[PDB]
Write a protein that binds this ligand. Structure first.
Ligand SMILES: [Cl-]
Ligand SMILES: [Cl-]
Ligand SMILES: [Cl-]
Ligand SMILES: [Cl-]
Ligand SMILES: [Cl-]
Ligand SMILES: [Cl-]
Ligand SMILES: [Cl-]
Ligand SMILES: [Cl-]
Ligand code: NA
Ligand code: NA
Lengths: 98, 98, 98, 98, 98, 98, 98, 98
């Protein structure tokens, strides 16, 4: 009779986290499980080949400052891209605040 | 001579399921294979780090009420996000009905 | 309490047309109102600058063979792109058939 | 120094409306300004060539049941697509409810 | 011989503006030409039916706090959606800063 | 000085195959490696939970007629969705022909 | 019986142009009709508020070097964004060449 | 109080590489980890079934010329698609240059 469309829920409607929970507090690398959540990865990309170093984070602003490192295919050492600070400072999740 | 475009079929043209088939009826967790179908996951996201608890379901309306749980990277325990009811109530698949 | 997502309906769930209704049967140009439906136009594109000539059409297969013409910005004459037949032969709408 | 991405706000974060405000209560046609909000129109589509008849609406469920009509290019009369009820029954906007 | 793909340039690679240039400084409404740049509008949406009131703006942070108003189809008066502050506070454009 | 955008190549610019190469000619199931190419799968979907039965194929038209089967999470048996023929008949790849 | 998907043709399958045809050779501004083709404009953006100056073009490489100018909402004068050369150098259309 | 949208960072804002680092200099195949970065793969595609041969590369222009090879499902031999040169010549990453 009538078409009643369904829905697939956006992940950001179900999941949020304080920025301090995103990274290992002693190594300062984002936990592997959250790298695809912070970075829009190309389809099929092998996440074992990258890591995100947390250079800064703000509890007040719920922001992270990160630097990407990637695995050199020859040596298998993680190397930085291309200085001293973060490549990007961003607010990972939607907030409802002042 | 002439360009004749091809097509890639949308999964929702081939697959549908009654909502009672989406979850384990004794544990009340959505089966692992259907979590990406219900939730739009970011590219490369590790589904082993989440699970969906079915809080409610309606056979009449073909809806599910779910709560997301995620694996704490330190303890490896599944923890709820941020109460008592579902985070979302939705109709997973297109329906043709009253 | 619970998030209940809404929906915006895809135009193709509401609209379909026999291919003979898509074009002026005497001029053999697709009606202006259907050009954006047949061709995925870039956002903001001025449709007055193009037209689609129907070179072939199939009632049995519900296909159209078209050639695009565009308005030369200097002369304001419609000119073909870059032979004798259609640039593309395609089935504009979803069908449920043999 | 650091890249700080900006954002473009999704319209659905700013706009919502009770379903009774979506249509003319005497003619039962969705107001012209809301047709692109309810239907995902192809880029550049001429909205003057369509209208949405409200066949049903639910205040309790915040749903609308609509039928699309389109302008015949020859006669300029609005004609239905392809019965007696709505083509689709849907919830236009996100809701937070029971 | 070889396929050499072309490109369409993203608008954000060519255009940026200080936030004070986005709105009329005496009326505090975003200029009409920038409303589609700040808000992701559905395809074909009639922008004459909305306006964005600037409730706050930050020169230091390059952010705007806005409230959406829409035209009531009956009275043709602009009315707010659904309090006293902005509905959203966001950074419209990418920044490279501290 | 000047921004020179790069490009990521669409898979369909590099890959095409005759339809007879898409499936095992004795079992009549599409080869596992091509299931994501024929069906637009949701991000993260476990392809081990589905298979595509080739019900028909046309060398002349370069089309396939398929039926989807999915793994029942309890029994681990592949079961059809919801008759006797294909669920869909489509042309997987772009063609340049008569 | 079987679902047979339709198609909407991508504009780039039908339209291509030598780069010298994209702009007025005496004013060196891209013709208005091609601005949305070269730049990915946000939905609903008023193209009367921008123009593209051609700073360089290459017949051999089929590239254009452009600078965007926008209309100041107060004075109604076209002003450049934020030097002496192009903001971007790109190849507008797909090519098959050496 | 106010909605403050978050962001997910595009991979191309964090990662770039000289084209000589994209492939094994002795075998002339793109490293496995970069195949999804160069080619837009369908969701869920098994990258073990393809490889990219570098036929040409330009240090001056930061371009690569590649040919795709895929694994024949029967023999498990890598075979070329459908001559002697690259299928595509492209610039993988955004550049800021002359
Ligand atoms: Cl925190
Ligand atoms: Cl059920
Ligand atoms: Cl017909
Ligand atoms: Cl209401
Ligand atoms: Cl400012
Ligand atoms: Cl074949
Ligand atoms: Cl030229
Ligand atoms: Cl290099
Ligand atoms: Na994926
Ligand atoms: Na549009």
């Amino acid at each position: 009779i009538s078409f009643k469309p369904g829905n697939q829920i956006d992940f950001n409607r179900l999941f949020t986290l304080p920025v301090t929970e995103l990274f290992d507090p002693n190594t300062m690398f984002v936990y592997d499980q959250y790298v695809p959540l912070l970075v829009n990865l190309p389809s099929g990309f092998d996440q074992a080949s990258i890591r995100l170093k947390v250079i800064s984070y703000s509890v007040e602003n719920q922001t992270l400052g990160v630097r990407l490192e990637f695995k050199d295919p020859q040596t298998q050492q993680f190397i930085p891209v291309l200085s001293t600070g973060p490549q990007t400072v961003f607010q990972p999740f939607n907030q409802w605040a002042d």
